[PDB]
Symmetry: C3
Subunit: 437 residues, 3 copies
C-alpha cells in the first residue's frame, strides 16, 4: 500500500512572536467566574442551549460521513436473481427462458491509496467538526455570562434612576417650601419640576432595557425558569486572567477556530494524495458464484453451479489532462487552506491585543471617572448651599445634579465594559472549555 499525500508541515504563524503588553495556565472557568450565579446559568445553558445541541449533532454528522466514505475500502457482497425471456418477431424460433441467480464479491485493491486518503480527509474533517463544537461551547460560555452581567447592569441602572427621582423630588420640596415663603423665584421650581419629569422618562427607558435583557438571557439559557434578580454584592464577580511578563503568540495556536482551520488544512493534504493516486493504475478483484438454467425446476441443481474470479487492472493514458487539472484544484484549495489558517490566527492576535489594550484603557477611565464623581458631589453640595443663601441661581444646582446623574450612569457602564472585556480576554485565549484544573 502507498500514500501519495504530502507530509504535514504546520504553516508558520504570520504574527509577532509576542503581544506588546510565570506561565499562563487554563484554570477552569469555575476559577474565573467568581459569582456563583453565572456558574449556575452556564451549567443550565450547557444542557439546554439549542446552538450547542446543533454543534454536537454536526460532530455526529461528520463521524457518520467518515463511515460512509470508509466503506469503499472493504470487500462488498451482493446478490441478484433474474429471468430472461428472448424470442424473435417473425421467425417461429420458440421463445427462450433463462433463469439466473448470482452472488458477487467486489473489492478495490487501492494500491496507491486513493480511497485510503479520501477516508483520511474525512477523518480530519471530523476532527475539524469537534474543534468546531468546542468553539461553539466556549462562545456559549461567553454569551451566557455577558447576558447575565448585562441583565445586572439593567438592574443597577433602573435602581439608581429610581433613586435619583426620589432625590429630585426632595429638591422640588426644598424649592417648593422656599416659594411658599417668598425666598426664591418660581424659575427654580419649574427647573426642579423639569428634572422630575425628565427622570421619570429615564426610569421608563431603563425598565424596557431590563425587560429586554431578561428575554435575551432566557433565549441563551434555552429554559424559561425564574430569571436571576439583582445581586446585593457589587464587585469581585470575575477573577481576571494572570498573564506572564512576555506572552507568546503560540497561545493562539490552541484556539478552537484555529485548530479547526488546521484540521481542514490536513484534510486538504489528503485530498492532494487522492488527486495523485488518480494518475496510477487501479486493481479490482471480482469473484462470483452463479447458477443459470433453462427451466426453473432445476435452477438450484448440480450441473448449473458456476464460479468465477476476475482480477482487473485499469490504467489512465490520455484524459486531455483531466487528472492534471484535478491535481491543480487540490493543490490550489490546499493553499486556500493555508490562507484560511493564517486568517484565523491574525484575527485571533488582533482580538487579544485589543482586549489587553482595553484592560488598561478601561481601568484608567473608571478610576478617573470616580474622581470626577467625588468632585461632582462636592460641587452639588456647595451649589445647594450657596443657592440656599441667594449667592447663585438654581441653574448651578441643576447642572451639578445633571452631571452627577450622567457620571453615575457612565461609571455603571464602565465597570460593565471592564468585566465583559475580561471575559473577552478569557475567551480569546482558549476560554471556558475546561472547568477544573
Amino acid at each position: 500500500c502507498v500514500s501519495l499525500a504530502p507530509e504535514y508541515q504546520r504553516p508558520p504563524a504570520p504574527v509577532p512572536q509576542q503581544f506588546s503588553l510565570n506561565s499562563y495556565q487554563d484554570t477552569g472557568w469555575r476559577n474565573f467566574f467568581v459569582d456563583p450565579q453565572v456558574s449556575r446559568l452556564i451549567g443550565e445553558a450547557l444542557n439546554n442551549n439549542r446552538d450547542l445541541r446543533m454543534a454536537a449533532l454536526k460532530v455526529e454528522e461528520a463521524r457518520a460521513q467518515f463511515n460512509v466514505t470508509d466503506a469503499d475500502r472493504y470487500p462488498q457482497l451482493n446478490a441478484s436473481s433474474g429471468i430472461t425471456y428472448n424470442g424473435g418477431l417473425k421467425g417461429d424460433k420458440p421463445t427462450t427462458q433463462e433463469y439466473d441467480a448470482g452472488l458477487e464479491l467486489s473489492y478495490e485493491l487501492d494500491f496507491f491509496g486513493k480511497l485510503k486518503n479520501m477516508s483520511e480527509a474525512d477523518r480530519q474533517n471530523y476532527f475539524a467538526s469537534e474543534e468546531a463544537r468546542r468553539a461553539v461551547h466556549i462562545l456559549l460560555v461567553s454569551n451566557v455570562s455577558q447576558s447575565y452581567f448585562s441583565q445586572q447592569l439593567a438592574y443597577e441602572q433602573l435602581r439608581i434612576a429610581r433613586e435619583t427621582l426620589k432625590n429630585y423630588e426632595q429638591s422640588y420640596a426644598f424649592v417648593e417650601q422656599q416659594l411658599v415663603t417668598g425666598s426664591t423665584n418660581v424659575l427654580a421650581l419649574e427647573q426642579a419640576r423639569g428634572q422630575i419629569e425628565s427622570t421619570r422618562a429615564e426610569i421608563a427607558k431603563r425598565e424596557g432595557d431590563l425587560a429586554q435583557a431578561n428575554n435575551a438571557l432566557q433565549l441563551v439559557l434555552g429554559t424559561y425558569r425564574a430569571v436571576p434578580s439583582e445581586k446585593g454584592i457589587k464587585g469581585g464577580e470575575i477573577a481576571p486572567v494572570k498573564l506572564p511578563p512576555n506572552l507568546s503568540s503560540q497561545i493562539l495556536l490552541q484556539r478552537p477556530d484555529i485548530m479547526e482551520a488546521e484540521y481542514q488544512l490536513k484534510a486538504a493534504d489528503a485530498n492532494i494524495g487522492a488527486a495523485r493516486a488518480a494518475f496510477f493504475p487501479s486493481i479490482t478483484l471480482t469473484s462470483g458464484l452463479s447458477s443459470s438454467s433453462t427451466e426453473l425446476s432445476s435452477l438450484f441443481t448440480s450441473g448449473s453451479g458456476m464460479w468465477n474470479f476476475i482480477p482487473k487492472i485499469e490504467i489512465p493514458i490520455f484524459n486531455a489532462g483531466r487528472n492534471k487539472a484535478n491535481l491543480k484544484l487540490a493543490e490550489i484549495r490546499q493553499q486556500q487552506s493555508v490562507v484560511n489558517y493564517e486568517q484565523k490566527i491574525q484575527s485571533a492576535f488582533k482580538d487579544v491585543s485589543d482586549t489587553l489594550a482595553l484592560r488598561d484603557s478601561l481601568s484608567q477611565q473608571l478610576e478617573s471617572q470616580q474622581r470626577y464623581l467625588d468632585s461632582l458631589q462636592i460641587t452639588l453640595q456647595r451649589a445647594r448651599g450657596l443657592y440656599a443663601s441667594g449667592a447663585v441661581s438654581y441653574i448651578e444646582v441643576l447642572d451639578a445634579e445633571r452631571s452627577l446623574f450622567a457620571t453615575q450612569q457612565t461609571i455603571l457602564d464602565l465597570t460593565y465594559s471592564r468585566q465583559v472585556n475580561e471575559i473577552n480576554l478569557f475567551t480569546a485565549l482558549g476560554g471556558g472549555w475546561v472547568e477544573k484544573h
Copy 2:
C-alpha cells in the same frame, strides 16, 4: 408498495405557553396601516421589489426540482443505433459488420418506496420554499412601511430644525436691540450668535438624513417615481394589534419561518425513509425490441427483429456498513431539523415578548417626555422674562432653549420608535400576508 419513512410528529414547542403581557385574528394589512400612503407604496413594492421576485423564482426552482426527481418513478423509453466493425490484426479473418437498432423500456418497481420517499422530500421542500416566499413577503411589507415612516421622521426633524433656527434668530434680535441701547452685556449676544450657527449645522445634518431616507425608500420600492412628501396630518397612521388577555405561544407556530422549518423537518423524515429502503431489494423491469443484421441492406427486414424482457432483483448483503452509516446520517440530519425548528420558535417568542414590553416602555417614555416638554416651555418663558429684567443671566435662556430642542427631537424619535415597534409586533405575529 411500502413507505419506510416515519410518521410525522410535530415537536413540542420549547417556549412558555403564554406571553407575559377576545381572540386574535389577522385583519388584513389594510386595517393595520391607516395611512393611505403606506398602503400605496406597499402596492408599488409588491410588484417591483427584486427580493420578492427572487423569492418567487425560488419557489419555481423548487417545483421544477420536484419534477426532475419524480421522473425516476415512471417507465422510461430510449432508442439506440449502432454499427460494429470487428476484425483481426494478423489472422485473415474478414472484417465483420454488425448493424443494430434498439428500443428499450426501463422501469424501477420501487417496492419499498425509495424513489417515492425522495420525491416526497422534494415535495416537502417545495412547500418550504413557498413559506419562504411568504416570509420574504411580509418582511418586505415591514421594510417598506418602516422606510416610509423613517422618511417622514426625517421630514419632521428637518422642519422643526428650520423652525428652531428662526426662533434663535429672533432671540438674537431680542438681545441685539438691548445691546444697541446698553441694557445687557455682549456675552448674551455671542451666546445667541452661538446657537444660531449650531442650529445651522443641525439643519445640514437633517437634510443629509432626508436625502438618505429618500434613496432607501426608492431602493425598497424598486421604482424611482416621485417620493412622498411630508404629511400635514400627524397621528393615527397605524391601528395597533388588539391582543387577548392571555395570549398563546401557539400563534408563533403559523409564522412563515417556523412553518418553513417544519416543512424541512418533514422532508428529513422522507430522507430517512429512502435511507431505510436502501437496505431492501430492488426490482427492475427492462423490455426491449431490437433489430440486428450483418449487411445494412436488411436491417429493418423480417428475420432480424427480436424482443426481450428481463425482470431483475438485486439485494445488498455486505457493504461494510455503508447503508447503516447513510441511515445514521439521515437520522442525525433529521434531529438537526428538529433543532432548527426549536431555534426558530424560541427566537420568535423572544421577539414578540420584546415588542410587548417595548409597547409599554415606549408609551410611558413618550408621555413623561411630553410632560418634561411642557415644563421646559414654562422654564424658557420664565428665563426669558427674568433675563429681560436683569434677574438672571442669559445662560438660563440658553439652557432652556437647548433642553427644549433636545426634547423636541427625542419626542419625534420616540413616536417613531413607538409606531415601528407596533409594525414589529404585527409582523412577528404573522404579518402582512393577508390584506382582507
Copy 3:
C-alpha cells in the same frame, strides 16, 4: 456542431439614467490619494493582505475547474489487462483461464453542443471570479485607507484632549490664585477640579481608541512593522472625484460586483444551452485494440491481436419529463441571474446617490461647525473676562469650555466623515483598480 444556448442580451438597467446631483475618467488611485503614507500602506497591503490572497487563489481554482470540465470534449485513451477464471461446481469441466489486454479510445461527438456549452458556463464563471478578485482588490484599498485615516483621527483626538487638559489645569490655577486671596468662592474651584478629572477620563478613552486603530491597521496590512505616527500637516490628503454636470448611471455597469453578476448571467445562458442539448441524440465513437489468449505464454503473439470500432447513437424518447423539468430549472435559474444582476445595480445606484448627498451634507455641517467654533471661542474669552471681574459666575466659563471641547471633537469627526465619504465615492465608482 450546434449551440442551443441563447444569444446574450444585457438586461436594461433598472435605475434612473442620471444621478440627481466634462467627462468622468479613472485617474489612478495614486492621484486620488494625495497623502504618500496611504499610498505606501496600500502597496504594503497589496502584497500581504490574506483576503486578496484568497481572492487570487479563487481565480486559480476557477481556471482549474474549467480544465476539469473541458476534458470531456477531447478523445480519451485507457488501457486495461485482466485474467478471467471460469469453472463448474460439480461438473468435472476443467477450469478455464482467459487472459486479456486492451487499449480503448473513447470520444463523445457532442453534435448539439452539450459539453461545449458546459465548458462555456465554466469559462464565464472564471471571468466571474476574476471580477470578484477585482472587487476584493478595490475593497482592500478602501479598507486600508479608511484604517489609516481612522488611525490619524485617533491621534488628533488624543492630542487635543491632552491639550485641553493643560488648558483646564491653567483654569484651575487661575481660580486657585483668586481663592488663596479671597476674591472668589470655592464653588469655582470645585468646578475647575471637575473639568480636570473629567478630561483625564477622556484621555484614557482616546488612548484606547488609538491602540485599537493601530491593531486594526496592522490586521489589514497583514504585516506588523512600525505603524505610522501622527501627521504634522493636516489637510489635502485626498483629491476628490471630479464629476460632470449630468452624470450617467452607466458608470455603475463597469463596477466589479455588477460585472461579476453579468458573467454569471452569461454562464446561466450556457447552462440553458446544455439543458436543451439534453433532448437531442448523442453520438459516441469507441475504437479498440485488444489481445486475448488462453495461456499467458502467447498473450502478445500473432493470432491474438484484434481491432474494434463501434459508433453508437442514443436518443431519448420518454423520460417522464425529466429533460423538460431540467430545462425549466435552467431557464428559471437564468431569470434568477437577471434578478441578481438588477439587484447589484439598484444597490450600487443607491450607494452613489448617498455619497453624493453626503458630499453636500458634510461640507455644510463642517462649515457651520467651524463658525460655531469661532463664536464659542469669543464666548469663552468673554465669560472668563466677566468672571474675573465678578459679573458672572464661573458656570458661564464652564459651559463655554464644555461647548468648545465638544465642538473641537465634532469638527475632527466631521472632516473624517468628509474624507471617508470621498473614498466611498471613489470606490463605489470603480475605485482603486488602476494606478
